[PDB]
Structures are given as structure tokens and as C-alpha cells.
Symmetry: D2
């Protein structure tokens, strides 16, 4: 017995309550949406953006994937990015990781010979890890795990800022801000891990890796 | 203007309110997760699964992408599927489309020459459309849109069922059901489009495309 | 003992002979290339385009993959396509399949539950197969295999013509032709399976699937 | 103008000429293939492996893409790797870059905002570049280009070695070597850049990045 009845009943009860409380709660976004936020976070069942920020339908457009990864070569994450920045004109991009992230643990501990698609998928985390060996070697398994989480949020903010989409948006004057935040499943709170970035100037100040050199590498050539 | 303060206050208020109603609402989920559902749905800002099924943290692991598309060759969606079926051992997979879906409209109206990554990405939508062109010819814009959304849900339910991850899970007797639902953003309500599929037999009864023929094609060669 | 010596010696011997015969054979393409052909064919070791067409370096730009597949969502094949049409201004695209293609056999006979990346990868062939059940059911394994090969070449020519790259090139007046050909490893010969396509007009005439309806689907709506 | 006749005559002439020199040149390869090599190389029209190593049909299975890039998350290249190592049981993997490589130049000079898929695709080249920025600072355009080509070969040899497919093959005692070569289009000559790697021990001796640390990172956690 798989039977969706309880789910459907809970959905009807929820829809009624919201409309009873505000009669245009739903009808106002019947035929259109204008979110101001894109949120990129982990598929993990404990981390639901609309509910942890207590948001109404129509406020946050959402990519959720194993590990909250952003890569220029993932058309799944990239079309979420292009569609919200180019078509919907969002103003803020939230990259959120969270403690006790299983993707980030697999990234520390799995041997690359491990079978299946998840191990391909988290290659990104291994690479972030490998560049940051000096911050992780010799920590206890637990501290290394937490640290892996933060380091990944920082890498993924950098990847957002370096993406063709965000770079083209900045170059044409479209206001757009990027945010690194992390969530703790055990307390329900979100901490700002990286202050707002609104263009190259902020990025130079706020990120370890050098975004200007990434974009304009050929200036450092003779 | 780029300040995150409104969001953090909201998150605080939200976390206290939940910790009041229930002492262990967060603490019980601090170091692991045992969700029973995987949800695959559209990235659209109006369709938030934990909110709309009114679920607590830890109940639904989430993939969201533009058009709620499921392909064997997308490692982003596939790793959500593999990690939940193989590692977390979920029992139910929700495939959820929604009326007023911009991805589905784009898959009806855009010309293939359109530049950018969203247009590459929604190629699956054109395939569903083309296979079912007889069902869509001479309907009105708005009716073809609604029909496209529904055909897309059915196609994606087929793709979940046909996936290596689900086929392997069934073949080793892991119990796993797959469901097609559609959400109406204007009313907040979910409607079951496809009754529960728990194995090959259900799929023979419930899907228009032949799953058995797909899996055992060579049985019908001389 | 892995030792590249024999390979390197054969390469030196070959380079000498060609330069001895035509002293600018290599030097003329030292610093640049201007191929007129893109070739898309199978990774299979028996099928080398430059050698079967007896071509000099600098003549045919080459994508080779398992099964000779073209999909808008494969950035590997797609960047080969964009780079040669947009940057190098090639004039002709050869899509070549071949008999005794192992990808095309796996596409007939593997069960989708089969582990590993090749089985994900050839999902494209299964889909071509599924649409063409009526041409394949009841044939002997051998005739079905040959037929699968031709059907795949036709699908992939259609995919070339439908790609954003080729569509944008035609729409801006750039001359570009697409060709379906097949090769027989046992005789070293190539047969033209589909006559030249240079735009929509030819495509309407030469391909079973309807390219015009694919591009302009919304014209058939009320 | 779109006529294929010149090509078919060339193919004929070519097939007869080979069938004369050797009776069974094609017939011996008509129904199967047992290549000993997999070659991964650039799609560039001047670099044809079977031609340049002067090989007969059936000897080298080929992947070619723009920049000869190897990533765990590209199913196109990965299926070439899995099918050859696991099904065909090849013994040697050639990773081949080439001077004058347009992909490598693009990875030095293009700004990330550049539109289209080639720019997404060559993101791996920017990563190699960035990790090795110290090695490239204040070199001249042309020298940085040559150094980029070489660093790219080494990075891609590392990625082949680090892949799940090769790590699994070694771990079950399958003999498998990996080689880094570079071709000079101006002279037709190949130079060995990296001596043969046949297992973990060779990679410790031959590669600048630490393969063991990459595979066994968690050994160095407290
Ligand atoms: Cl969500
Ligand atoms: Cl080749
Ligand atoms: Zn996580
Ligand atoms: Zn949608
Ligand atoms: Zn083949
Ligand atoms: Zn190249």
C-alpha cells in the first residue's frame, strides 16, 4: 500500500487555511510569477528554502541538487540560472550549504573507484577539497566535515560569480547580488557566511580566489 | 539594498516559533535524515513541496529543475535518484508538474534557433511534444499548454520507471512506488494524475507507452 | 612493459615519408586550419574518417563517440558543432554510422537496469528504437541490428538539422550542408544513405520526421 | 556544390588499393574489433590518430573532443573510457594534446561572459590554467600557449588515472597503462610528454599532483 490520500488531504487542508487567511494568496500568482530570489541549495530533506525563510508562493525560484553544486557544464543548474536572471530578472542569488551535508562527507571519504552516478556527480567536491588540503588535513573527521561545508559554499559562490550568466548580467548593468549562507539542520538557523557581492569590486574584497584574474587572465601575460 | 537582514529575522522568528510548538522539531533531525519521499518538481517559485504538503524537516528529499524533467543522461537529477533509492532507501517518488509552467510553454512555442542554455535544456519537452503531436494539433494556446503539462508529467513518470536506478531497485525486490501529480498554482491544490505504480505490472496498466516492451524489446526479435 | 617506442618510430617514419613527398604537407597548417568538413562518427576502432576518405591533415574536423550520437544536451558534441560552424565556417557535416556497431546492438538488447555509464549514454539509441518498433519487431537479430544502424543515422541527421547551431546558421544565410552516410567495416566502403540537405526545403523532402513542424510547432495550434 | 562524389571516389580508390596490398585488410575486421589502444585527442582537423601512428583498421578506438578534455561528469568521454576498459579490454590509453590548440588559446584569452556552448565546455581549461597560474605569469602569448597545451595534457592524464573506470581496473589487477603525448601539427611528429603509468606507483613518480592523496584523502584525517 502506497496511497497518496494523507498527502492530498494535508495539501487541501493547507490550501484552505492559507486562502481563508488571505483570499488572494494563490489567485494573485495564478498566471504569472515575479520572484526576486534564486536559491541554490542541497537536495537534503531537512533544508527547504521557502519554509526556513517563511516565504509565500512566488518569492524564491529554487535549484536543489546533491551538494548544492554550480558548474558551467551542468545544464540543469545553468538553465535555472539563465532563466531567472535573463527572463525573470531576479535581483539576489542565494547559495546555501548546510552542516551534516552527506554530499560533503562523501566528497571527503569516498574512494574514486566507487560505482554509480553519485560518485561521478560529487567530483566537484573532491576538487574543492584537493585545493584546500592545508585547511583539512589533520583535523578530526567532524571538524573536517564542517569545514568542507563552508569551503564548498565559498567555491560555489565563486562559481556563481564566474558563470557566463552572472558575468553578462553585470557587464550590461543589471543589478544582481550573490550571497553565501549556511544552514544548521539541528537548530533551524541560517548564518551569513559571505557578505553580499554585487560586482567585481565586492568579489575582489570578499572571496579568497581571485575573480578578476579569472576573468581577465590574459592581462597578466607579456 | 543588497542587505539580507529581513531574511535572517524571518528565519529566526520561524525557528523560535517551531521550537516553541515542539521541543525537538530541529534537534531530532540534527545528525541524520530518514525521508520516505523523493520529490522531483519544477524550479518555478510558486511550487514548494514541503510547504504545499505541509511537511516537517526530514520528510521529502528534493530535486527541482526547469520543467521537472528526468533524463538518464542528466547526472544532477540522476544522483538525486540514486542517492535516495540506494543510500537513503526512500519508498515513494513524487513526479510533480504544474499548470502555468513556463518550461512547457517554451517547449511549445520557441524556435530551436533560440540562443542560450534554457533552450538546450528544454529539448526533452520538445520530444514529448513531438511524440504526442496528434494530441495537440488544433487545440487553443491555453489548452495545448495544459495538455503539454500533463503529457510531460506522464513522460517523466515513464522515465523514472525506466531508469536504471528504479529498474534495479524493483529487480532486487526493494519496495518503491512512483506517482504523477500536478499542482495548480492559482488554488494551491495538487491533483493525482497517475495512480501509484509499484512495479512492472502497475506500469502496464497505467502508462500509455509500453514499459515492458521498452525493457524487453529483444524478446520480440526473431 | 608498456613502451611507446614502436608507435613513435612509426610516427617518425610516416611524417618523413609525407614531407619527402610534399615538402609543405605539414608546414602549411603549422599555425592554422581551415577544414571544410565536420565529421560525426563512432568511436569504433575500424572507422577512421581521414583515412577512409584518404584526406590530408587540415581537411576534416572530427567528433567520434560511442554510437555517433548528437544531442542538444551533450556539450561535448555540441561544442564541436558550434566551434566548426560559428568559428571555422565549415561547409559540410558528415554524420556517419557503420554496420556492426556495438552501440547500436547494446541499444537493441541491453536491459535498462544494466550498471555503468555506457548504458546511460546509449539511452538515445533506445529512444530511436522505441519510435521505430514497427520496423524492427520480428526481424532476425542480424537484420534488426543493420536496420538499427540506418535508423540511427537518420535520427542523428535530423538532430544535426534541428540543432540550434545549424538552425541559426541557415537562418543567417550561411551555406551549410548535412549528409547521412554509413560505412561497412568488412569492405571499407561508404554508402550515401541520405542525399544532401542544405536547408528546410531539402529536409522536408529527404527526412521521414517533419523538421518544419518541429521548428514551427505553434503554427499548428489554434 | 553540396555533392559528395569526390569523397566516394576517394573512398573507393582507397578501399581497392588496400584490398590489393592485403587480401584480408577489411574482411578480417568485418564482425568484430580487438583494439589495444584508446586514444583521447583534440577534434582539431590536423590530428588524426590512425593516420599519424600509421595504423590499420581495428587498432585504436577513438574519442575526440575540443581540447582533448577528460572529465568524470562528461558521459560522452566516460562511455568511451568504460566501454574500452570494461568491454573491449584495451591495454593502453593515449592522452594526446597538440601545439597550436585553439581550445587551449581560448582557455587563456576568452572572458567568461562569452556566449555559446564552446565557452561552457572549455571551463576545464580555465581550471587547469588557474591552478597553474604561477607557471604562466609574465610569459609571452605564444609561450603561455605552448605551456597551457602541456599542462593540459598532464591534467587530463591525471583525470584518466583518477577516473572510477581506471581506478577500478587497476584495483582488480587489469593491466592498463596511460600515456601523455603531444603532437606538433607543423611537423607531423609526436613527442612523449609523460612516461608510461601502469599503476599507483608510477603516478606517484610521474605526476605533479598527488594521485594517492586524491584517492586516500581521509587517511590523513584525525
Ligand atoms: Cl523546495
Ligand atoms: Cl579520427
Ligand atoms: Zn547536503
Ligand atoms: Zn514550471
Ligand atoms: Zn559503432
Ligand atoms: Zn585542439
Amino acid at each position: 500500500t502506497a496511497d497518496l490520500s494523507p498527502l492530498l488531504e494535508a495539501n487541501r487542508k493547507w490550501a484552505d487555511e492559507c486562502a481563508a487567511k488571505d483570499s488572494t494568496y494563490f489567485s494573485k500568482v495564478a498566471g504569472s510569477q515575479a520572484p526576486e530570489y534564486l536559491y541554490i541549495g542541497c537536495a537534503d530533506s531537512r533544508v527547504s528554502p521557502a519554509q526556513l525563510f517563511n516565504m509565500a508562493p512566488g518569492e524564491v525560484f529554487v535549484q536543489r541538487n546533491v551538494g548544492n553544486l554550480v558548474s558551467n557544464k551542468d545544464l540543469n543548474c545553468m538553465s535555472c540560472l539563465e532563466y531567472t536572471v535573463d527572463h525573470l530578472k531576479i535581483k539576489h542569488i542565494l547559495v546555501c550549504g548546510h552542516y551534516n551535508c552527506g554530499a560533503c562527507k562523501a566528497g571527503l571519504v569516498w574512494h574514486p573507484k566507487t560505482a554509480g552516478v553519485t560518485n561521478l556527480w560529487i567530483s566537484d567536491v573532491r576538487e574543492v577539497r584537493d585545493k584546500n588540503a592545508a585547511k583539512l588535513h589533520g583535523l578530526s573527521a567532524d571538524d573536517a566535515w564542517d569545514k568542507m561545508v563552508e569551503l564548498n559554499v565559498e567555491a560555489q559562490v565563486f562559481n556563481v560569480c564566474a558563470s557566463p550568466i552572472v558575468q553578462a548580467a553585470w557587464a550590461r548593468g543589471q543589478p544582481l547580488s550573490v550571497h553565501g549562507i549556511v544552514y544548521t539542520p539541528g537548530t533551524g538557523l541560517v548564518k551569513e557566511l559571505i557578505k553580499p557581492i554585487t560586482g567585481m569590486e565586492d568579489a575582489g574584497a570578499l572571496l579568497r580566489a581571485d575573480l578578476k584574474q579569472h576573468c581577465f587572465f590574459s592581462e597578466s601575460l607579456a
